[PDB]
Amino acid sequence: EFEFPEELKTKLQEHINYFPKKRQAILLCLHEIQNYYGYIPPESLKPLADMLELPLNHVEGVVAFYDMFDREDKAKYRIRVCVSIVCHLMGTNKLLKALENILGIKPGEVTPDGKFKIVPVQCLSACSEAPVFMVNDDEYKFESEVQLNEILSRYT
Amino acid sequence: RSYPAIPRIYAETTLNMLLKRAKKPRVHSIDEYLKDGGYQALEKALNMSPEEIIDWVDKSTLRGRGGAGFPTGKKWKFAVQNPGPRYFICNADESEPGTFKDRIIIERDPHLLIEGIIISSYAIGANEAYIYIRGEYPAGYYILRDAIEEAKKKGFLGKNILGSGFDLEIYVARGAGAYICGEETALIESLEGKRGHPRLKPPYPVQKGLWGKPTVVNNVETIANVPFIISMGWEEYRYIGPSDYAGPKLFPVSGKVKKPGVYELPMNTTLREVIFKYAGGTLGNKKVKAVFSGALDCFSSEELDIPMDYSPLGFGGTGTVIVLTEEDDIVEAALKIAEFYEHETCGQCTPCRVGCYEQANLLEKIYKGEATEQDWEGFDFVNRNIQPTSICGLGAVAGRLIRQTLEKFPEEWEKYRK
Ligand SMILES: NC(=O)C1=CN([C@@H]2O[C@H](COP(=O)(O)OP(=O)(O)OC[C@H]3O[C@@H](n4cnc5c(N)ncnc54)[C@H](O)[C@@H]3O)[C@@H](O)[C@H]2O)C=CC1
Ligand SMILES: Cc1cc2nc3c(=O)[nH]c(=O)nc-3n(C[C@H](O)[C@H](O)[C@H](O)COP(=O)(O)O)c2cc1C
Ligand code: SF4
Ligand code: FES
Ligand code: NA
Ligand code: NA
């Protein structure tokens, strides 16, 4: 039987108690689960459904619909790279080349240590600072390979 | 506390209203906001009737800054003719390509938005308000949660706000990667703990919204105007810009300009003035080829003298200005727009589901020179046939910008057809 570690379950209960209805907390709970495990473990969904008082198929359908949730790959740090119009115009391909030179991986791949996954995303709405990437919650303009290397060195 | 890293987007204002504080790239907390006379508009509003506030917002000419430009006062009037309880929703899902106007209010001057939400909620008799912020704005989320706690501490939220007898709580919900969750009915479905599937309209949210109750959805930038309308009065607000499309507007400018960033300007400003007078002209002084109004419209270099207003011949939309210069491939640019709609259709409507996919799949073959004659004819047909049976704006416009590039840059498309 899969069980949420007490420190996670406490946070999930806080989200569920925050909104007037429990089911409104579903996305905040799944963010919290992904933050804890580095992905959404399939086994996590049944106990979450129970806490939200929703059918399991409802929760599964929500996880499948929302692109930020990942049931496939565990990663400590998600490098979200914008592949939309403005970042493409201003040098997404230079950022991807620099990421491949430093980490040895392409969009969709995880480093062999499970540290970094490159996630291609649509417009991150920081287009004046193109090309844009995030490292988990942190968001940056890509300037050059030397600058990117310094930034990535801060994630240990 | 410390927040996640945010790029320091350049912000410039000729009006010193929405960007009075947000022109500086840092969090302005409640003490700084109060020093500038913050929350005095709320105090003024709570001494007015809800009906009077609606009248002022109506007379201000404020139009929906989310991009459709629907008259804000008239939206509120529709809501309040329906029995309560009623809900107020702040739309902070901002996900249109090139559009970064709302985030600089959220991340730099959150109390301007919060004050606006409280006044708007009182105006329509809502005791529960929601901010729905996209998942990819985690800093915005933490800044808003902290700002709401500051407002509670100072007695601007909770029960019986400043002895008015008006109760309000503001809940912050997060998105999780879906552009479609900015569509007001898909947003409401997401708030209800479901997939972001748009609802058939009518009914509009003001008739049937959150839990089927009358619900007003307004954009961050729209709501940020409300404290100015109350503070100045609707007459003084109408002095700003042209009297038919009045008030400050935020213009997020990106791509091939010297000074990319957000400009607070009146809506009588022309597209040419945004690019050349404010954004410093083009990179390398190259000729403008096109302006993408996010993923909605493509304007040619012949259309730069149009006003940035909500008029029939105006720029309209979000005010988003993506500048392409003479060396940028329009078909390459069209492929990026097709890829966007492919990735974001929710799939409820068949022509939208298949059309957004086929438009991107066929345009990729065209771009790579692998398209058969039937792929070419297929692409043309699919582009014209995404809209049929569509129940939201995505299917209605998924072919719009691309069709405008086929009409305005035929020479460039023909190069690919060979
Ligand atoms: N800011 C962003 O990041 C994004 C902005 N958009 C914008 O979304 C716009 C399309 O939005 P829609 O909501 O589909 O536009 P719309 O024109 O159908 O509706 C606009 C607003 O007016 C209300 N309304 C319209 N007719 C009404 C009536 N008869 N009674 C009561 N209320 C009524 C709607 O409920 C809505 O709140 C586009 O112009 C685009 O610029 C789209 C995607 C992302
Ligand atoms: C696919 C789609 C996505 C949308 N995304 C947003 C968004 O991120 N933010 C927003 O304010 N409006 C968005 N809208 C527009 C809303 O449906 C709605 O018109 C707006 O939030 C109403 O506020 P306003 O009258 O103050 O502009 C979107 C519409 C569509 C069709
Ligand atoms: S038009 Fe497209 S995005 Fe809108 S509801 Fe239909 S399938 Fe979904
Ligand atoms: S196009 Fe990359 S952040 Fe907008
Ligand atoms: Na401060
Ligand atoms: Na910002």
Short mmCIF file of N, CA, C and O and ligand atoms in Angstrom, two decimals, chain A residues 125, chain B residues 64-71 74-76 78-79 81 91-102 134 137 179-180 182-185 201-207 215-219 293-297 310 316-320 340-341 391-394 396-397, ligand 1:
data_model
loop_
_atom_site.label_atom_id
_atom_site.label_comp_id
_atom_site.label_asym_id
_atom_site.label_seq_id
_atom_site.Cartn_x
_atom_site.Cartn_y
_atom_site.Cartn_z
N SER A 125 6.06 33.65 -21.64
CA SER A 125 5.64 35.06 -21.45
C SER A 125 6.76 35.86 -20.74
O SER A 125 6.47 36.58 -19.77
N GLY B 64 -12.06 45.37 -21.83
CA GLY B 64 -11.30 44.17 -21.44
C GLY B 64 -9.90 44.16 -22.01
O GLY B 64 -9.75 44.05 -23.25
N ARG B 65 -8.90 44.23 -21.14
CA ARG B 65 -7.46 44.27 -21.49
C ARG B 65 -6.93 42.86 -21.76
O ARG B 65 -5.77 42.75 -22.20
N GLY B 66 -7.74 41.82 -21.53
CA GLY B 66 -7.39 40.42 -21.83
C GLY B 66 -7.18 40.20 -23.32
O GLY B 66 -6.46 39.25 -23.67
N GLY B 67 -7.81 41.02 -24.18
CA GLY B 67 -7.58 41.01 -25.63
C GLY B 67 -8.85 41.18 -26.45
O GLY B 67 -8.73 41.60 -27.62
N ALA B 68 -10.03 40.85 -25.91
CA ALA B 68 -11.31 40.94 -26.66
C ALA B 68 -11.88 42.36 -26.60
O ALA B 68 -12.67 42.71 -27.49
N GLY B 69 -11.51 43.16 -25.59
CA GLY B 69 -11.94 44.56 -25.45
C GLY B 69 -13.43 44.71 -25.14
O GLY B 69 -14.00 45.75 -25.53
N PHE B 70 -14.04 43.76 -24.44
CA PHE B 70 -15.46 43.86 -24.03
C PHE B 70 -15.62 44.96 -22.97
O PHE B 70 -14.81 45.04 -22.04
N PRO B 71 -16.63 45.85 -23.07
CA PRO B 71 -16.80 46.93 -22.09
C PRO B 71 -16.99 46.36 -20.68
O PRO B 71 -17.93 45.58 -20.46
N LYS B 74 -20.25 47.13 -18.59
CA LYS B 74 -21.41 46.43 -19.20
C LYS B 74 -21.35 44.94 -18.82
O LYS B 74 -22.43 44.39 -18.53
N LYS B 75 -20.16 44.34 -18.71
CA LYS B 75 -20.01 42.94 -18.23
C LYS B 75 -20.56 42.86 -16.80
O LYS B 75 -21.38 41.96 -16.53
N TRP B 76 -20.15 43.78 -15.92
CA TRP B 76 -20.58 43.82 -14.50
C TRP B 76 -22.10 43.98 -14.42
O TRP B 76 -22.72 43.29 -13.59
N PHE B 78 -24.41 43.02 -16.56
CA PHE B 78 -25.01 41.70 -16.92
C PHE B 78 -25.01 40.79 -15.68
O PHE B 78 -26.05 40.20 -15.37
N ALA B 79 -23.88 40.72 -14.97
CA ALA B 79 -23.71 39.85 -13.78
C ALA B 79 -24.75 40.20 -12.70
O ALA B 79 -25.38 39.28 -12.16
N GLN B 81 -27.62 41.69 -12.68
CA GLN B 81 -29.07 41.51 -12.96
C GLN B 81 -29.46 40.06 -12.61
O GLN B 81 -30.67 39.79 -12.59
N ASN B 91 -8.22 36.80 -14.08
CA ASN B 91 -7.54 35.92 -15.07
C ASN B 91 -6.07 36.33 -15.15
O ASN B 91 -5.79 37.38 -15.79
N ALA B 92 -5.18 35.54 -14.56
CA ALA B 92 -3.71 35.73 -14.63
C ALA B 92 -3.07 34.54 -15.34
O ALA B 92 -1.94 34.16 -15.00
N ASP B 93 -3.75 33.97 -16.33
CA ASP B 93 -3.22 32.79 -17.08
C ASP B 93 -2.27 33.22 -18.20
O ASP B 93 -1.61 32.33 -18.75
N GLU B 94 -2.20 34.53 -18.49
CA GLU B 94 -1.34 35.16 -19.54
C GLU B 94 -0.39 34.15 -20.19
O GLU B 94 0.68 33.88 -19.60
N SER B 95 -0.74 33.65 -21.37
CA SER B 95 0.04 32.61 -22.10
C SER B 95 0.09 32.88 -23.61
O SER B 95 0.70 32.05 -24.30
N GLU B 96 -0.51 33.96 -24.12
CA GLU B 96 -0.43 34.33 -25.56
C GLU B 96 1.03 34.61 -25.91
O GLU B 96 1.69 35.38 -25.22
N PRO B 97 1.57 34.02 -27.01
CA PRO B 97 2.91 34.35 -27.47
C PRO B 97 3.16 35.87 -27.50
O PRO B 97 2.30 36.60 -27.96
N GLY B 98 4.30 36.31 -26.97
CA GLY B 98 4.75 37.71 -26.97
C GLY B 98 4.11 38.54 -25.88
O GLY B 98 4.42 39.75 -25.82
N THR B 99 3.24 37.96 -25.05
CA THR B 99 2.38 38.71 -24.10
C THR B 99 2.94 38.53 -22.68
O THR B 99 2.85 37.41 -22.14
N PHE B 100 3.51 39.59 -22.12
CA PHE B 100 4.14 39.59 -20.77
C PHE B 100 3.79 40.87 -20.01
O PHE B 100 4.55 41.28 -19.10
N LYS B 101 2.65 41.49 -20.35
CA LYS B 101 2.16 42.75 -19.74
C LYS B 101 1.67 42.49 -18.31
O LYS B 101 2.05 43.28 -17.42
N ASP B 102 0.88 41.44 -18.08
CA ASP B 102 0.19 41.20 -16.79
C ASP B 102 1.20 40.85 -15.69
O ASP B 102 1.00 41.30 -14.54
N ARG B 134 -1.13 31.17 -14.15
CA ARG B 134 -0.53 30.04 -14.91
C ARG B 134 0.54 29.39 -14.03
O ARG B 134 1.20 30.12 -13.24
N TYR B 137 4.23 30.76 -13.79
CA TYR B 137 4.47 32.00 -13.01
C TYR B 137 4.56 31.66 -11.53
O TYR B 137 3.77 32.17 -10.72
N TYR B 179 -2.60 26.49 -22.12
CA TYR B 179 -3.01 27.79 -22.72
C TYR B 179 -4.53 27.94 -22.64
O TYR B 179 -5.01 29.07 -22.41
N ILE B 180 -5.27 26.85 -22.86
CA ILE B 180 -6.76 26.87 -23.00
C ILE B 180 -7.39 27.28 -21.66
O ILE B 180 -8.52 27.77 -21.69
N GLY B 182 -6.82 29.73 -19.91
CA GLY B 182 -7.05 31.19 -19.92
C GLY B 182 -8.39 31.55 -20.54
O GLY B 182 -8.89 32.66 -20.28
N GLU B 183 -8.95 30.66 -21.37
CA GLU B 183 -10.34 30.83 -21.88
C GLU B 183 -11.25 30.78 -20.65
O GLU B 183 -11.09 29.85 -19.83
N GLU B 184 -12.11 31.79 -20.47
CA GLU B 184 -12.78 32.06 -19.18
C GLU B 184 -13.57 30.84 -18.70
O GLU B 184 -13.60 30.61 -17.47
N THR B 185 -14.20 30.07 -19.59
CA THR B 185 -15.04 28.91 -19.19
C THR B 185 -14.14 27.71 -18.86
O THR B 185 -14.46 26.99 -17.90
N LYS B 201 -21.05 28.61 -25.05
CA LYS B 201 -21.54 29.97 -24.68
C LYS B 201 -22.48 30.44 -25.78
O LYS B 201 -22.21 30.18 -26.95
N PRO B 202 -23.62 31.11 -25.48
CA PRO B 202 -24.09 31.29 -24.11
C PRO B 202 -24.49 29.97 -23.44
O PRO B 202 -24.64 28.96 -24.12
N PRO B 203 -24.66 29.93 -22.10
CA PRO B 203 -24.50 31.11 -21.24
C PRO B 203 -23.06 31.62 -21.10
O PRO B 203 -22.12 30.84 -21.17
N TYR B 204 -22.92 32.94 -20.91
CA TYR B 204 -21.67 33.59 -20.47
C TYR B 204 -21.55 33.44 -18.96
O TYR B 204 -22.54 33.23 -18.25
N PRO B 205 -20.31 33.49 -18.43
CA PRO B 205 -20.08 33.34 -16.99
C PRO B 205 -20.97 34.24 -16.13
O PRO B 205 -21.39 33.81 -15.08
N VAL B 206 -21.25 35.46 -16.60
CA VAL B 206 -22.05 36.47 -15.84
C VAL B 206 -23.46 35.92 -15.58
O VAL B 206 -24.08 36.37 -14.61
N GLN B 207 -23.94 34.99 -16.41
CA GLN B 207 -25.23 34.28 -16.21
C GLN B 207 -24.98 32.98 -15.42
O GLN B 207 -25.71 32.75 -14.44
N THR B 215 -20.76 34.89 -12.50
CA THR B 215 -19.29 35.00 -12.34
C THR B 215 -18.77 36.04 -13.33
O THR B 215 -19.10 35.93 -14.53
N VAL B 216 -18.02 37.02 -12.85
CA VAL B 216 -17.28 37.99 -13.70
C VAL B 216 -15.84 37.48 -13.80
O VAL B 216 -15.21 37.27 -12.75
N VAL B 217 -15.36 37.26 -15.02
CA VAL B 217 -13.92 37.01 -15.30
C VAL B 217 -13.36 38.29 -15.91
O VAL B 217 -13.94 38.77 -16.91
N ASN B 218 -12.31 38.84 -15.30
CA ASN B 218 -11.58 40.01 -15.85
C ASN B 218 -10.08 39.73 -15.80
O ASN B 218 -9.61 39.03 -14.89
N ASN B 219 -9.39 40.28 -16.78
CA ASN B 219 -7.92 40.23 -16.96
C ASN B 219 -7.25 41.10 -15.89
O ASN B 219 -7.83 42.13 -15.50
N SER B 293 0.60 40.25 -33.79
CA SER B 293 -0.23 40.57 -32.60
C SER B 293 -0.45 39.25 -31.86
O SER B 293 -1.43 38.55 -32.17
N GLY B 294 0.50 38.88 -31.00
CA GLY B 294 0.60 37.53 -30.43
C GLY B 294 0.49 36.46 -31.50
O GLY B 294 1.25 36.53 -32.49
N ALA B 295 -0.43 35.51 -31.33
CA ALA B 295 -0.76 34.45 -32.30
C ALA B 295 -2.10 34.74 -32.99
O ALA B 295 -2.66 33.80 -33.56
N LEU B 296 -2.58 35.99 -32.95
CA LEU B 296 -3.95 36.38 -33.40
C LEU B 296 -3.92 37.00 -34.81
O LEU B 296 -4.71 36.55 -35.67
N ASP B 297 -3.08 38.01 -35.04
CA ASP B 297 -3.06 38.80 -36.30
C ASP B 297 -1.61 38.99 -36.79
O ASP B 297 -0.68 39.01 -35.96
N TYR B 310 -9.14 49.71 -29.63
CA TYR B 310 -10.10 48.59 -29.83
C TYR B 310 -11.10 48.94 -30.93
O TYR B 310 -12.18 48.32 -30.97
N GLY B 316 -5.87 46.51 -31.70
CA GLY B 316 -6.70 45.69 -30.81
C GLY B 316 -5.90 44.58 -30.16
O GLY B 316 -4.70 44.78 -29.89
N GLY B 317 -6.55 43.44 -29.90
CA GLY B 317 -5.95 42.29 -29.20
C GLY B 317 -5.39 42.68 -27.84
O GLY B 317 -5.96 43.56 -27.18
N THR B 318 -4.29 42.05 -27.45
CA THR B 318 -3.62 42.24 -26.14
C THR B 318 -2.75 43.51 -26.15
O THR B 318 -2.31 43.91 -25.07
N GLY B 319 -2.49 44.09 -27.33
CA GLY B 319 -1.47 45.14 -27.53
C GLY B 319 -0.08 44.55 -27.74
O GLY B 319 0.91 45.30 -27.68
N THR B 320 0.00 43.23 -27.95
CA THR B 320 1.26 42.47 -28.13
C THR B 320 1.85 42.80 -29.50
O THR B 320 1.13 42.65 -30.50
N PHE B 340 2.17 26.08 -32.10
CA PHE B 340 1.52 26.58 -30.86
C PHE B 340 0.09 26.02 -30.76
O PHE B 340 -0.24 25.38 -29.74
N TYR B 341 -0.74 26.25 -31.78
CA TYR B 341 -2.17 25.84 -31.78
C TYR B 341 -2.28 24.31 -31.74
O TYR B 341 -3.14 23.81 -31.00
N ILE B 391 -16.37 25.81 -30.17
CA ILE B 391 -17.14 26.40 -29.04
C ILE B 391 -16.25 27.36 -28.23
O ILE B 391 -16.71 27.81 -27.17
N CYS B 392 -15.04 27.69 -28.70
CA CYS B 392 -14.21 28.76 -28.08
C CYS B 392 -13.32 29.43 -29.12
O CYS B 392 -13.26 28.97 -30.27
N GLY B 393 -12.68 30.52 -28.70
CA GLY B 393 -11.90 31.43 -29.56
C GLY B 393 -10.68 30.76 -30.19
O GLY B 393 -10.23 31.29 -31.20
N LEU B 394 -10.16 29.68 -29.61
CA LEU B 394 -8.93 29.00 -30.12
C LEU B 394 -9.21 28.46 -31.53
O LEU B 394 -8.50 28.87 -32.48
N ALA B 396 -11.64 29.25 -33.42
CA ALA B 396 -12.09 30.41 -34.22
C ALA B 396 -10.89 31.12 -34.89
O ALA B 396 -11.13 31.73 -35.96
N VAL B 397 -9.69 31.09 -34.30
CA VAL B 397 -8.54 31.93 -34.76
C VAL B 397 -7.29 31.10 -35.08
O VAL B 397 -6.31 31.70 -35.54
N1 LIG C 1 -3.84 37.53 -22.53
C1 LIG C 1 -3.52 36.34 -23.03
O1 LIG C 1 -2.48 35.75 -22.70
C2 LIG C 1 -4.45 35.72 -24.00
C3 LIG C 1 -5.42 36.48 -24.53
N2 LIG C 1 -6.35 35.99 -25.48
C4 LIG C 1 -7.39 36.85 -26.04
O2 LIG C 1 -8.64 36.22 -25.91
C5 LIG C 1 -9.53 36.90 -26.81
C6 LIG C 1 -10.76 36.07 -27.06
O3 LIG C 1 -11.47 35.90 -25.82
P1 LIG C 1 -13.02 35.48 -25.65
O4 LIG C 1 -13.36 35.35 -24.20
O5 LIG C 1 -13.26 34.28 -26.53
O6 LIG C 1 -13.72 36.73 -26.34
P2 LIG C 1 -15.21 37.27 -26.45
O7 LIG C 1 -15.24 38.47 -27.33
O8 LIG C 1 -16.07 36.11 -26.89
O9 LIG C 1 -15.62 37.62 -24.93
C7 LIG C 1 -14.92 38.66 -24.21
C8 LIG C 1 -15.53 38.85 -22.84
O10 LIG C 1 -16.83 39.47 -22.97
C9 LIG C 1 -17.83 38.62 -22.44
N3 LIG C 1 -19.02 38.69 -23.28
C10 LIG C 1 -19.07 38.66 -24.65
N4 LIG C 1 -20.29 38.70 -25.14
C11 LIG C 1 -21.10 38.77 -24.02
C12 LIG C 1 -22.50 38.83 -23.85
N5 LIG C 1 -23.37 38.81 -24.86
N6 LIG C 1 -22.98 38.90 -22.58
C13 LIG C 1 -22.11 38.90 -21.57
N7 LIG C 1 -20.77 38.83 -21.60
C14 LIG C 1 -20.32 38.77 -22.86
C15 LIG C 1 -17.22 37.22 -22.36
O11 LIG C 1 -17.84 36.46 -21.33
C16 LIG C 1 -15.76 37.56 -22.05
O12 LIG C 1 -15.54 37.79 -20.66
C17 LIG C 1 -8.68 37.19 -28.05
O13 LIG C 1 -9.01 38.47 -28.58
C18 LIG C 1 -7.23 37.15 -27.54
O14 LIG C 1 -6.58 38.41 -27.71
C19 LIG C 1 -6.24 34.69 -25.89
C20 LIG C 1 -5.31 33.88 -25.41
C21 LIG C 1 -4.30 34.29 -24.40
#
